[PDB]
Each structure stands twice: as C-alpha cells, then as structure tokens.
Scaffold this active site. Structure first.
Site, PDB file in Angstrom:
ATOM      1  N   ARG A  39       0.891  -1.140  -0.015  1.00  0.00           N
ATOM      2  CA  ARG A  39      -0.003  -0.005  -0.098  1.00  0.00           C
ATOM      3  C   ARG A  39       0.918   1.223  -0.032  1.00  0.00           C
ATOM      4  O   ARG A  39       0.490   2.374   0.194  1.00  0.00           O
ATOM      5  CB  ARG A  39      -0.875  -0.040   1.226  1.00  0.00           C
TER       6      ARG A  39
ATOM      7  N   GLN B  34      14.557  -1.963 -26.075  1.00  0.00           N
ATOM      8  CA  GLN B  34      13.100  -1.753 -25.931  1.00  0.00           C
ATOM      9  C   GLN B  34      12.411  -2.233 -24.782  1.00  0.00           C
ATOM     10  O   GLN B  34      12.526  -3.486 -24.164  1.00  0.00           O
ATOM     11  CB  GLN B  34      12.748  -2.667 -27.040  1.00  0.00           C
TER      12      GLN B  34
ATOM     13  N   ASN C  14       8.384  -3.123 -23.660  1.00  0.00           N
ATOM     14  CA  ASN C  14       7.240  -3.415 -23.980  1.00  0.00           C
ATOM     15  C   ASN C  14       6.217  -3.620 -22.775  1.00  0.00           C
ATOM     16  O   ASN C  14       6.493  -4.173 -21.770  1.00  0.00           O
ATOM     17  CB  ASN C  14       7.255  -4.760 -24.793  1.00  0.00           C
TER      18      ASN C  14
ATOM     19  N   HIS D 147       7.235 -17.500 -28.758  1.00  0.00           N
ATOM     20  CA  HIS D 147       7.970 -16.629 -29.475  1.00  0.00           C
ATOM     21  C   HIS D 147       9.338 -16.439 -29.234  1.00  0.00           C
ATOM     22  O   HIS D 147       9.719 -16.706 -28.301  1.00  0.00           O
ATOM     23  CB  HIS D 147       7.067 -15.092 -29.658  1.00  0.00           C
TER      24      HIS D 147
ATOM     25  N   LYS E   3      15.352 -11.324 -23.121  1.00  0.00           N
ATOM     26  CA  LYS E   3      14.101 -10.694 -22.329  1.00  0.00           C
ATOM     27  C   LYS E   3      14.112 -10.771 -20.881  1.00  0.00           C
ATOM     28  O   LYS E   3      14.255 -12.044 -20.416  1.00  0.00           O
ATOM     29  CB  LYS E   3      12.744 -11.268 -23.014  1.00  0.00           C
TER      30      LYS E   3
ATOM     31  N   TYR F 107       8.169  -5.879 -19.887  1.00  0.00           N
ATOM     32  CA  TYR F 107       9.569  -6.574 -20.415  1.00  0.00           C
ATOM     33  C   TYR F 107      10.465  -5.712 -21.288  1.00  0.00           C
ATOM     34  O   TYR F 107      10.088  -4.720 -21.861  1.00  0.00           O
ATOM     35  CB  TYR F 107       9.291  -7.931 -20.980  1.00  0.00           C
TER      36      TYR F 107
ATOM     37  N   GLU G  52      11.188 -13.417 -36.785  1.00  0.00           N
ATOM     38  CA  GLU G  52      10.303 -13.863 -35.637  1.00  0.00           C
ATOM     39  C   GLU G  52       9.933 -15.285 -35.955  1.00  0.00           C
ATOM     40  O   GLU G  52       9.482 -15.564 -37.200  1.00  0.00           O
ATOM     41  CB  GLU G  52       9.232 -13.225 -35.319  1.00  0.00           C
TER      42      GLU G  52
ATOM     43  N   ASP H 247      -0.732 -16.688 -33.007  1.00  0.00           N
ATOM     44  CA  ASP H 247      -0.347 -17.787 -32.318  1.00  0.00           C
ATOM     45  C   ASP H 247      -0.855 -19.253 -32.411  1.00  0.00           C
ATOM     46  O   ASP H 247      -0.408 -20.226 -32.025  1.00  0.00           O
ATOM     47  CB  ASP H 247      -0.401 -17.419 -30.456  1.00  0.00           C
TER      48      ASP H 247
END
Ligand SMILES: CC(=O)O[C@H]1C[C@H](n2cc(C)c(=O)[nH]c2=O)O[C@@H]1COP(=O)(O)OP(=O)(O)Oc1ccccc1
Ligand SMILES: CC(=O)O[C@H]1C[C@H](n2cc(C)c(=O)[nH]c2=O)O[C@@H]1COP(=O)(O)OP(=O)(O)O
Lengths: 183, 183
Positions: B24, B48, B50, B63, B73, B133, B144, B170
């Site tokens: 809190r 980067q 995200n 991925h 990551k 991330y 990819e 996916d």
C-alpha cells in the site's frame, strides 16, 4: 505509434503512445532506444528502472541529483493517475524556475521526459498510483537535493486543495534558492 | 536483499528485487544495469521496453527471433498474475526442448530473465494482467518464429484448467519440429 508534444519548456517532452488494441487486450512499446534518441537528438542511456506505489494525496517532493549524478528521467504511470511536475533548475537557463505539470495515468499512457537539470515531483490523484520511470544515472544518496513542493518562487499549481501527505524529507525540503546554493 | 534463483535450465534466472515498504506504499528498482550485468557476467543492453495487457486465459506465445535478431528478455508482471514460460531452443544445448515455468505477479514482483536462444510465452491467470518486459534487441517480424503452446515435444504443463485464448497468429504456430529455429 507515439505522439510527441513539446511543453512550455523546450527540453521537456510529453509522449503519448497509442496502443495496438485487440481482443486479448493491448500491446505497445513503452520505450524504444533508437526512436527516443532520434527524438531527443542525443544519445541517452537509461541505467535504472524504478517502480513505486503511493496512496491518494501522497506527493513525492521535488527531487534531483547534483552535477555528474544528475538524472534524466522518463516517467509514466502504470496504475491510477498522478499529476507530474518538472522544474527547470539550471541557473543559466532562460526558463530557470519554470515548471511543467502533466496528468499521467495508466489510462492515458502519457510519459514525461525530464532531462538532467530539472527537479521532479508528483502527487497521487487516484486511490493508489503506481509510478514507473527510467533514470539516465544511478541513485546517489550523497547527491540528493530537494525543494519544497509549494515553493513560491516556482509557484507550481498543484491539482489538490488539502495539504499533501509528505515524507519526512520532503516536508523539510529547502526553498529553491537555498536548495541550489552550491549549484 | 535482492534474490537471484537459478532454475532447472542454467541460463534462465528468476529475479526477485529488493522491495521497500508493503503493498500500500512501496518502492523498488525493477532494473539496474550495473547489477544485472555483473549478475549475468556479460554486458547486456536493453533497447526496447514493451507493455501489454491481457484478459484471463489469454496465452501469448512461444515466440522468439532468429539469429542476429534474437532477443534476450527480462520480464515481469506489473498488474495481476501470469504463468511465464521459457523454452530452450538452442539445438546444440544440453537442455534443448526443456522449459521453465514461473508465476509472475504484481504482488510477488518476480522477474524472469530469458536469454537469447529461448522461446517465450505466458498465460494470464488473473482477470487481467499487465505484462512488462525489456528486450536486448529490436522487434523483427521477419526474424520472428513461433511454436504452438501445447507442443508435445516441449510438453509444457500449463496451469489454467481451461482452453487458452490465442491470437490468430499464435493459434497458427507450428510444432517444434516444423518451427523455423535458425537462419
Ligand atoms: C498492427 C499490429 O497489430 O502491430 C502488431 C506488432 C506490434 N509490435 C509487436 C512487438 C512484439 C514489438 O516489439 N513491437 C511492435 O510494434 O504490436 C502489434 C501486436 O503484435 P502481436 O504480435 O502481439 O499480435 P498480433 O497477434 O495482433 O499479430 C500481428 C502482428 C503484426 C501485424 C499485425 C498483427
Ligand atoms: C520514489 C522515486 O521516484 O525516487 C526515490 C527512490 C530512489 N531510490 C531509492 C532507493 C532506496 C534505492 O535503492 N534506489 C533508488 O533509486 O531515490 C529517490 C529518493 O528516495 P529516498 O527513499 O532516498 O527518499 P524519499 O523520502 O524522498 O523517498
């Protein structure tokens, strides 16, 4: 995509990402090195990410780090909403003492880029707010400096009426001129 | 103190940041360049950040990006909870095809470090989850690749007791032996 809006103070920028929204929910790059550097025009490295949670009305005093430890900060609000403020504290700057205030929320996804040479502060407007930011330099206790939130020389117009809930250290913060005595 | 927990797969690490305060009113460094680098033993640059939001049962994943575009990551969950998974997809690795699964929540503040050479995925366990991330390389659609979430060769034991919701991309992922792991 992200909209970049200039503020009354040149080096201070508001960033507004628009998210890729679909059925799962959404996705967006909250930061992209290459993009940010071209946008700022200079190389910039963020070495520390901070995450804090505050209750309504908690105001985290005006902070900054002196000299070589000055921190550029790219801030945003991941939960709730805060009124964020940047104050130019560069003595030789045309906008010295001027401030910029922006509402940052989990909803609007706005971010505020505050370069080295500014003092930073924010107040929690929602029941609770979770504040996230990236700093260009590391936390350094010996370098800390603060300025009282309601300093008249800066005259920030805070969105609230009541007196803010402050930490011991921010409630005892010096006035602008005192805070920058040796800077 | 900050905790780093090694998993069944050597290069995959669970990080549990030093947290000040309670739920809190708190503060923690979600990332610290210097700390992370000495932790990994090698220099690592994140270009980067995200941020995504998913509804319960949405499974995003398996991925990875090939070759020079492979992304390391460092992931965490700022809102809600997700079951995060890392799969070793380095053909020459002793742990190839093995996976590691960890619950990441806003509450526990755990983070999972997934090096280049791994496939990544996660399922939302809470009503909604906001996943954050950092990636060591830029998004690269042409680089990819994906792997179907329920691929038997990997055999991930997913927590949800109900069918996951998948983006069309996916849902169309190939099985491990058909995945485009290299080039
Ligand atoms: C139009 C659009 O939806 O753009 C994509 C790609 C984009 N994206 C995605 C990632 C992973 C990143 O690092 N940067 C980035 O900009 O974020 C969006 C979400 O990507 P996603 O991979 O999470 O999901 P998708 O299942 O809808 O498949 C799509 C992928 C590319 C284009 C259209 C659809
Ligand atoms: C909240 C915020 O946005 O930045 C804070 C917290 C930050 N900090 C604080 C600690 C304790 C740490 O290890 N690392 C770090 O970066 O340094 C700033 C000063 O924190 P502080 O705890 O020293 O003082 P305070 O009473 O004004 O909170």
């Amino acid at each position: 995509m992200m909209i970049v809006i200039k503020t009354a103070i040149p080096d201070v920028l508001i960033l507004e990402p628009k998210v890729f929204g679909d059925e799962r929910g959404f996705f967006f790059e909250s930061y992209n090195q290459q993009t940010f550097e071209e946008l700022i025009g200079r190389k910039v490295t963020f070495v520390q990410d901070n995450h804090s949670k505050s209750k309504k009305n908690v105001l985290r005093g005006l902070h900054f780090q002196r000299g070589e430890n000055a921190q550029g900060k790219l801030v945003r609000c991941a939960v709730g909403e805060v009124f964020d403020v940047a104050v130019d504290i560069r003595k030789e700057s045309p906008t010295f003492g001027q401030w910029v205030g922006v509402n940052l929320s989990a909803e609007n996804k706005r971010q505020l880029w505050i370069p080295e040479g500014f003092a930073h502060g924010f107040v929690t407007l929602s029941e609770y707010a979770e504040f996230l930011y990236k700093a260009t330099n590391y936390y350094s206790p010996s370098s800390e400096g603060s300025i009282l939130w309601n300093d008249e020389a800066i005259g920030i117009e805070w969105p609230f009426s009541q007196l803010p809930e402050l930490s011991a250290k921010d409630a005892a913060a010096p006035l602008l001129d005192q805070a920058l005595l040796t800077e």
